[PDB]
Design a protein around this ligand. Structure first.
Ligand SMILES: O=C(O)c1ccccc1-c1c2ccc(=O)cc-2oc2cc(O)ccc12
Lengths: 219, 216
């Protein structure tokens, strides 16, 4: 397979701005005839990934003008010369010169804002949960930017548990913010075994860890 | 003017099956280069199967990922190509896309979804997550609703009570061991709205039923 990679993995810009998304490869996708086999896919949500460009230079029907394909051999670049939001999405560079044919990680177009640090919020097991022999405490980091956070959980000051269901949501409406819910699941047994539950997360805006905590005994 | 149609996917249990049906109306099926590419959800696009045409002997290659297990084949006219995953090993689970080629270009499907588990059409237990040892609470109160151990995929959260414009942020469900787990929240006002109300409203068409959980 050809290592076909992209730079950057994400892209925060603003509607009027312009992007160069980077795709580069394993060897020069320069086939014999027809030659350079490398395509550009836009993928919008719950959608099929349409292509904008083929064999580097060729723009495909309807693909808006603001779109272009530069490249030569082992090196390529597509360019929005001004991002309307319609352009919002994952951009991939595929290659059809060297079986097995390849997609790069994609590169996600993003509105570039300020807006935020997560509002962490914690929540102890529900009575019925417990009376289910089940026990999961929950943490929500609400409305953050930039996306990268890290959540962690601490039982009795020094845990690490396995039981975490991390879920994530990008926004593409108003505030351009992203949110995160994280879930520790345990037995009713381990639950009444500890008391000191903690949710500690490190962020951009951080400096120091963002933590939320509660105590079986008290909180 | 062109269509690729991935006809028929779904549920299938770790193990030994599913034959997939794509259909491409609006080009010489005949003279093209057809294939199947995937990107499980929490997966990226990867490439699976390809077959060609007359001039190429209808060559067929199939990727390592599923080489000798998976298979791609084709029938001209209201031409339908087919992948044959008699052997599904769950990581094989995403949307499988059908695609044409030609000179340099190509089009893609809408794709057919494939989920694979030994789990069984279950139902979600739904819990009410009350601002409990928190501060936003007092000023701004967020309440979450946890809905878990249901299966399959299509449950519906929905909100209520209190009475205004509030910040619901409900996350993509995720697959826990062999069933889905979901959650929702509202940053809603202090006590104004606290003192009035708010009801979490959940439901699974998918079978079982729709439950209600109520903060407090
Ligand atoms: O580029 C072509 O000549 C061509 C024309 C019709 C059908 C397939 C191809 C085609 C190839 C033809 C011959 C060959 O040795 C390699 C080809 O690779 C392709 C790759 C594509 O992504 C898309 C198309 C091709």
């Amino acid at each position: 397979d050809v290592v076909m990679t992209q730079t950057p993995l994400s892209l925060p810009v603003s509607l009027g701005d312009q992007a160069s998304i980077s795709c580069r490869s394993s060897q020069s996708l320069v086939h014999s005839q027809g030659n350079t086999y490398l395509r550009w896919y836009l993928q919008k949500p719950g959608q099929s990934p349409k292509v904008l460009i083929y064999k580097v230079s060729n723009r495909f029907s309807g693909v808006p003008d603001r779109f272009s394909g530069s490249g030569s051999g082992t090196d390529f670049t597509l360019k929005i010369s001004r991002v309307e939001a319609e352009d919002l999405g994952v951009y991939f560079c595929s290659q059809s010169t060297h079986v097995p044919w390849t997609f790069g990680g994609g590169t996600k177009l993003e509105i570039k804002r300020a807006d935020a640090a997560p509002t962490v919020s914690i929540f102890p097991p529900s009575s019925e949960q417990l009376t289910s022999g089940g026990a999961s405490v929950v943490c929500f980091l609400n409305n953050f930017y930039p996306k990268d956070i890290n959540v962690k959980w601490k039982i009795d000051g020094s845990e690490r548990q396995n039981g975490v269901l991390n879920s994530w949501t990008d926004q593409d409406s108003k505030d351009s913010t992203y949110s995160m819910s994280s879930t520790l699941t345990l037995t009713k047994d381990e639950y009444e075994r500890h008391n000191s539950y903690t949710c500690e997360a490190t962020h951009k805006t951080s400096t120091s860890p963002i933590v939320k905590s509660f105590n079986r005994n008290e909180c | 003017e062109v269509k690729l149609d991935e006809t028929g996917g779904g549920l299938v249990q770790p193990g030994r099956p599913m034959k997939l049906s794509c259909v491409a109306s609006g080009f010489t099926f005949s003279d093209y280069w057809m294939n199947w590419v995937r990107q499980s959800p929490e997966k990226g696009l990867e490439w699976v199967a390809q077959i060609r045409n007359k001039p190429y002997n209808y060559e067929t290659y199939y990727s390592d990922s599923v080489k000798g297990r998976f298979t791609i084949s084709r029938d001209d006219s209201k031409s339908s190509v087919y992948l044959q995953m008699n052997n599904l090993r769950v990581e094989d689970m995403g949307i499988y896309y059908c695609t044409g080629s030609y000179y340099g270009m190509d089009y893609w499907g809408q794709g057919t979804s494939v989920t694979v588990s030994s789990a069984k059409t279950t139902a979600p237990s739904v819990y009410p997550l009350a601002p409990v040892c928190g501060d936003t609470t007092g000023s701004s109160v967020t309440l979450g609703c946890l809905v878990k151990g249901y299966f399959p995929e299509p449950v519906t959260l929905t909100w209520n009570s209190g009475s205004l414009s509030s910040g619901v942020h409900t996350f993509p469900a995720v697959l826990q061991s062999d069933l889905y787990t979901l959650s929702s929240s509202v940053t809603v006002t202090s006590s104004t709205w606290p003192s009035q109300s708010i009801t979490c409203n959940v439901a699974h068409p998918a079978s079982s039923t729709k439950v209600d959980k109520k903060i407090e």
